[PDB]
């Protein structure tokens, strides 16, 4: 701790201890009135402006502080479908500025959280931002800090949230650890496991080997889509079915996620899809405390009622047929 606090953090050794961490998720929610300056490309400009504001907040030395064009912001690259389809797509023998044997899906930089000289110390967090984005896949920004004031980072997050809300989107905060570990950390947290009413892997009304070869969790993914959820773990191995050019590693570490995670588009609830078809459902206490209980109970009812789940699965089968 004293070594990394003195500027000797370049040891490049995986320490067993972690600093203070915060994970923020950008979720497309709603376009504000006016601000015309299409509802599917203004969010592209919103993420571009957010990344530009983050990179413009880079911590700089006094020699670069006294001096006066900075480099352009890194590009965020968009695609449709699972991420492994895009990874098995870069093979194209054209260009070199396309996600470029571990693949760094994010990049990091040190920021200058207090610019105005409000604090007597030197404030310095570390931001991690992804290099990919989909309208159906939520966006990740990560703040890692060790000794910063936990109020300047709050108003920095507020400035980011306002900059988002000028455009569409909605910045939310989710716990860094997995949803499945909240009973193993916080025993008071609400956490319900869902064994849904109709098993699509063995029901006679919904069963096909070709569909399960194509998409094993097709009914569950469509159930989560129709109930208003966005995929959090975009880089997991439970939904896509393709190969890879060795493992992918984030700019902060290896993804140690047991199951795929989903965030409600409101930002209030977190779901998690297990291997055996069960689900985990919990509320986001940080959003509720910073800023509403009938929605999660209604989702539990839809996952427990046979008729409503049958209707959603029938809609999934009807869309699969047509």
Query: Phi then psi for 288, rounded to 5 degrees?
Result: -65, -40
Distance in Å, CB of 302 to other proteins, minimum:
31
Closest to 111 (Cα-Cα) out of 56, 151, 49, 51 = 56
Between 35 and 85, CB nearer to other proteins: 35
Under rule CB under 8 A, residue 187 binds other proteins: no
CA angle in degrees (0–180, nearest 5) for 230-232-233 = 135
Q: How far is the CB of 89 from other proteins (least distance, A)?
A: 36
Give the tokens for residue 235: 């880089």
Using the structure block, give the residue that is written with the tokens 């939520």: 138
Tell me which of 162, 195, 207, 214 binds other proteins, using CB under 8 A.
162
Which 3 state secondary structure label does DSSP give 286? helix
**Does 30 interact with other proteins (rule: CB under 8 A)?**
no
The span of 87-95, 123-131, 157-165, 233-241 binding other proteins (CB under 8 A) equals 157-165
Length of the chain: 322
Is residue 33 a contact point for other proteins (CB under 8 A)? Answer: yes
* Strand segments (E) across the chain: 20-26, 77-78, 103-104, 106-110, 126-130, 132-133, 139-145, 171-174, 192-194, 229-231, 248-249, 260-264, 269-273, 279-283
Q: Is 151 in the site for other proteins (CB under 8 A)?
A: no
Three-state DSSP at 79 gives: coil
Stretch that binds other proteins, among 23-31, 111-119, 128-136, 155-163 (CB under 8 A): 155-163
Radius of gyration of the chain (CA): 21
Q: Is 290 in the site for other proteins (CB under 8 A)?
A: no
Residue 61 is a binding residue for other proteins (CB under 8 A):
no
What lies within 8 Å, CB to CB, of 178 at 6+ separation is 257, 258, 259, 261, 272
Sheet bearing 106-110, strands edge to edge: 106-110, 126-130, 139-145, 20-26, 171-174
How many angstroms separate the CA atoms of 195 and 276, rounded? 9
- Which of residues 9, 32, 81, 135 is near other proteins by CB under 8 A? 32
Q: Applying CB under 8 A, which part among 133-141, 163-171, 202-210, 300-308 lies near other proteins?
A: 163-171
Q: Report the residue number, 157 or 263, with the smaller CB distance to other proteins.
A: 157
Kindly state whether residue 119 participates in binding other proteins, applying the rule CB under 8 A. Answer: no
Phi-psi region of 234 (alpha: psi -120 to 50; beta: other; left: phi over 0): alpha
User: Taking CB under 8 A as the rule, does residue 121 contact other proteins?
Assistant: no
* Residue 115 or 135 having the CB closest to other proteins: 115
Task: Determine if 112 is a binding residue for other proteins (CB under 8 A).
Answer: no
Stretch that binds other proteins, among 7-15, 31-39, 188-196, 263-271 (CB under 8 A): 31-39
Measure the CA–CA gap between 169 and 28, rounded to whole angstroms: 4
Residue 42 sits in the site that holds other proteins (CB under 8 A): no
Contact set for other proteins, span 301-320 (CB under 8 A):
none
Total interface residues for other proteins by CB under 8 A: 9
In this complex, which beta carbon is closest to other proteins, that of residue 81 or of residue 158?
158
Q: Which residues contact 151 (CB under 8 A, 6 or more apart)?
A: none
Closest approach, Cβ 66 to other proteins, in A, equals 21
Measured from the CB atom, the residue of 9 and 32 that comes closer to other proteins is 32
Q: Is 159 in the site for other proteins (CB under 8 A)?
A: yes
Summarize as ranges the residues that interact with other proteins (CB under 8 A): 32-35, 159, 162-163, 165-166
């Amino acid at each position: 701790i004293d070594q990394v606090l003195a500027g000797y953090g370049d040891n490049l050794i995986d320490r067993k201890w972690h600093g203070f961490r915060a994970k923020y998720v950008v979720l497309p929610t709603d376009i504000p009135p006016n601000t015309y300056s299409n509802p599917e490309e203004i969010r592209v400009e919103g993420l571009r402006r957010l990344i530009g504001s983050i990179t413009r907040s880079r911590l700089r030395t006094e020699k670069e502080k006294k001096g006066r064009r900075e480099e352009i912001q890194p590009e965020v690259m968009f695609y449709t479908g699972p991420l492994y389809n895009f990874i098995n797509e870069q093979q194209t023998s054209l260009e070199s500025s396309a996600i470029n044997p571990i693949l760094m899906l994010s990049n990091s930089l040190v920021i200058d959280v207090d610019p105005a000289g409000k604090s007597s110390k030197q404030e310095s967090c570390t931001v991690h931002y992804d290099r990919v984005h989909n309208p159906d896949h939520c966006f990740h920004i990560r703040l890692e800090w060790l000794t910063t004031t936990p109020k300047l980072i709050d108003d920095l997050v507020g400035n980011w949230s306002r900059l988002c809300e000028r455009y569409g989107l909605k910045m939310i905060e989710i716990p860094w650890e997995e949803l499945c570990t909240i009973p193993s950390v916080n025993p008071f947290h609400s956490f319900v496991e869902i064994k849904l009413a109709i098993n699509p892997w063995e029901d006679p009304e919904f069963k096909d080997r070709e569909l399960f070869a194509k998409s094993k969790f097709y009914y569950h993914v469509y159930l989560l889509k129709a109930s208003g959820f966005l995929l959090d773990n975009r880089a997991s191995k439970f939904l896509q079915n393709q190969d890879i050019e060795f493992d992918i590693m984030y700019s902060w570490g290896k993804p140690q996620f047991k199951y795929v995670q989903y965030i409600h588009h409101t930002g209030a609830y977190v779901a998690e899809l297990r291997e055996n078809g069960c689900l985990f459902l919990a509320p986001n206490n940080i959003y509720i405390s910073r800023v509403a209980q009938k929605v999660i109970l209604n989702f539990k009812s839809t996952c427990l009622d046979y008729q409503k789940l049958r209707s959603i699965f029938l809609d999934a089968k009807e869309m699969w047929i047509t």
